[PDB]
Amino acid sequence: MGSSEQELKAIVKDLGCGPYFLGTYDKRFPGFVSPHKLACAIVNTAGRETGGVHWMAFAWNPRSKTCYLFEPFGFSDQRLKQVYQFEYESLLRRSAIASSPDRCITLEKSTQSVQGPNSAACGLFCCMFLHAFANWPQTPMDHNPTMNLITGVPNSMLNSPQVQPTLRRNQEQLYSFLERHSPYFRSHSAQIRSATSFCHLKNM
């Protein structure tokens, strides 16, 4: 809906990921059946019946046979299972089986947070990473023009009133990056920012 509708597609499209974008999915995403092309997808932690709770990105580099998992909070698999009841165990298996000769795969997932605890900007952070992936499929997590704009923070420090200013800045940079490269974002700024604000989910 407002906090990133399934129109991360429009933005993803604007960012030039079109030739690699499989689309938006819910927890049921099967995996990658693409042993020859770069593919990427924005997956939700929940089933469509629920409406969606957390957006995350998956990317596949057949050349290096590595699968990228970018979930904005950098949560451990243990905490992913707990907080969101999500597991990407079957999709990895499928992906190795369907896309790799030796049925092996290297998983590379972020271990740091770039998003604030009360922020509803997850879907947007995924689009920014997919831009990084499309342009630098060998080093998308860091060390590239796009991701150098934001700073990762050890997950244990997510709620620390100390790194909060780094996390709000990250989001300022997010918004401006989309502003620069996305006609759709530009023509929808007020709506998107307000729908995905840094403090959007703060308790009252």
Partner: peptide, 11 residues
């Protein structure tokens, strides 16, 4: 950017 973790996975 963010730090990542690489794991080999064979099935």
């Amino acid at each position: 950017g963010v730090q990542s973790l690489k794991r080999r996975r064979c099935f």
